């Protein structure tokens, strides 16, 4: 066939829009992020966050992507990523 790495997102007509808010609540299993754009409290799973929840905390800005679940179809956060942190990787 051919080679390549998912071309160069965004892919498909509909692109991916990342939203930013704040960590309203946080737990050992997951946490909630208060969207400062839609004024709604989102629910992000500890799995979404790429970094280490340890670093994360309640009251810190974070970037995520609003998606739709498959069990409830509700707007949940995914692939969370702390905004502040220009540190290399």
From Swiss-Prot:
Transmembrane segments: none annotated. It is found in: Cytoplasm; Cytoplasm, Stress granule; Cytoplasm, P-body. Residues 19-80 form the CSD domain. The modification N6-acetyllysine is found at residue 74. Component of a multi subunit autoregulatory ribonucleoprotein complex (ARC), at least composed of IGF2BP1, PABPC1 and CSDE1. Interacts with STRAP. Part of a complex associated with the FOS mCRD domain and consisting of PABPC1, PAIP1, HNRPD and SYNCRIP. The interaction with PABPC1 is direct and RNA-independent. Interacts with EIF4ENIF1/4E-T. Belongs to the UNR family. RNA-binding protein involved in translationally coupled mRNA turnover. Implicated with other RNA-binding proteins in the cytoplasmic deadenylation/translational and decay interplay of the FOS mRNA mediated by the major coding-region determinant of instability (mCRD) domain. Required for efficient formation of stress granules. (Microbial infection) Required for internal initiation of translation of human rhinovirus RNA. This is Cold shock domain-containing protein E1. The gene is CSDE1.
